[PDB]
Design a protein around this ligand. Structure first.
Ligand SMILES: O=C1Nc2c(ccc(Cl)c2Cl)/C1=N\O
Ligand SMILES: O=C1Nc2c(ccc(Cl)c2Cl)/C1=N\O
Ligand SMILES: [Ca+2]
Ligand SMILES: [Ca+2]
Ligand SMILES: [Ca+2]
Ligand SMILES: [Ca+2]
Lengths: 97, 146, 97, 146
């Protein structure tokens, strides 16, 4: 039988999307990663004159967007393991007779 | 992602573990009860997400064929050797790859659901391969998962 | 300056323990992983006579313990990133002047 | 895990981002406000865990020297190239490593906090290295993180 094996986890977590909330969270946060990556790059590399108040501002917005994406990814992993728990429970009935 | 007939009848039995009232449908409320009975604590939103990902007819509950799409996408299993080893490592106080027979008995007779001292006798007989009163838990777990 | 870098995450998540609840969750679940691993092994390999009702029972308890440990590990990762978010925010003040 | 004097005064400024009322201490309530202002949603227990892990005197709040033990254990940073690339990949509809200049402008002028069309003009000037109206976002991100 299955003995000590358990449902194999999805390697990367691109799922449970169209949970509109998580999906909307991703698009907005990802757009903001692009926004702040660009603005930090510009303000540290494409100016004659580095405005540090500007860099700090965009660093705050950059870290918040990056960490929002991490939050979604972690929640996806958690949802996936919750689902795998249910599949594992159902698979116990495969142990017969 | 295909399913033999054999594991349809058995998954029908599986369905009744989830369909608590037996009304033929699994709700977020039933899923919550089941998940908590397994020592987890999904939020309302997480329960709804679980129902939704396999919610074909969009009626907010899971039927049988929706219950099968969840399986078909996940019949693949994998060995648990590493995770089991990590569970033993929790009790490896000195991080040296060993747990003494005495400490294993102490763990098993006091923590979690527990084993009788007689059940522990049998576990240690198998686990202490070298008869030195010490359990190399990596080797023990490898034996059990072989 | 720090530009686009962020606080480096702890590789493995053995922390935030002595949150007694998480720590107690770990000891009990891990003991149960050992318990059910043993009982499944015994009932599938050390008997003349495999009792499948027994194997199913211990498979259910095994999956629940394994998934409880996963749950703790995921929560540790989440707590760690929350803390790293705070450190990242504080590090924006290192961008001067 | 040592801290120059230089980054003490700057971390003092950092403390006021957290100590909202300025009473000289950070509570779970203040941490909650700050974390939510950053788009996260820690639970009460998670806030308490954050306070507790650096709670030396065990008085339930974080002072300045406790605030520094949190840093000292984590001053190490690491590059974000991969994570930034993954954020661009969200908008790579065909999974081909490219986002068109037109689609990038559409994303940046409609999603999140947004850029002006003039700011987008500058971003695309830099991003479209080959002048082909297409952005190889892996290369663009590598340029920006160099
Ligand atoms: O996303 C899922 N939700 C599920 C699954 C499997 C079984 C059950 Cl009952 C539910 Cl609610 C899922 N896939 O494994
Ligand atoms: O565990 C932590 N809790 C923290 C940390 C850093 C800053 C703050 Cl305000 C808090 Cl509440 C921590 N380490 O980075
Ligand atoms: Ca029902
Ligand atoms: Ca449905
Ligand atoms: Ca305060
Ligand atoms: Ca304190």
């Amino acid at each position: 039988g299955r003995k000590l094996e358990l449902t194999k986890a999805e390697k990367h977590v691109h799922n449970f999307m169209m949970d509109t909330q998580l999906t909307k969270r991703v698009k907005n946060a990802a757009a903001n990663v692009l926004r702040e990556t660009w603005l930090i790059y510009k303000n540290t590399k494409l100016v004659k004159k580095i405005d540090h108040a500007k860099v700090r501002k965009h660093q705050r917005k950059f870290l918040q967007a990056i960490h929002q994406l991490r939050s979604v990814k972690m929640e996806q992993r958690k949802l996936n393991d919750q689902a795998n728990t249910l599949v594992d429970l159902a698979k116990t009935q495969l142990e017969h007779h | 992602d295909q399913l033999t007939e054999e594991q349809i009848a058995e998954f029908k039995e599986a369905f009744s573990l989830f369909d608590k009232d037996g009304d033929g449908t699994i709700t977020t409320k039933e899923l919550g009860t089941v998940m908590r009975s397994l020592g987890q604590n999904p939020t309302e939103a997480e329960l709804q997400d679980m129902i939704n990902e396999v919610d074909a007819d969009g009626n907010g509950t899971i039927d049988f064929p929706e219950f099968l799409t969840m399986m078909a996408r996940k019949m693949k299993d994998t060995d648990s050797e590493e995770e089991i080893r990590e569970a033993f490592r929790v009790f490896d106080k000195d991080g040296n790859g060993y747990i003494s027979a005495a400490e294993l008995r102490h763990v098993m007779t006091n923590l979690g659901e527990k084993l009788t001292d007689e059940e522990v006798d049998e576990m240690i007989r198998e686990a202490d391969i070298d008869g030195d009163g010490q359990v190399n838990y990596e080797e023990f777990v490898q034996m059990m998962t072989a």
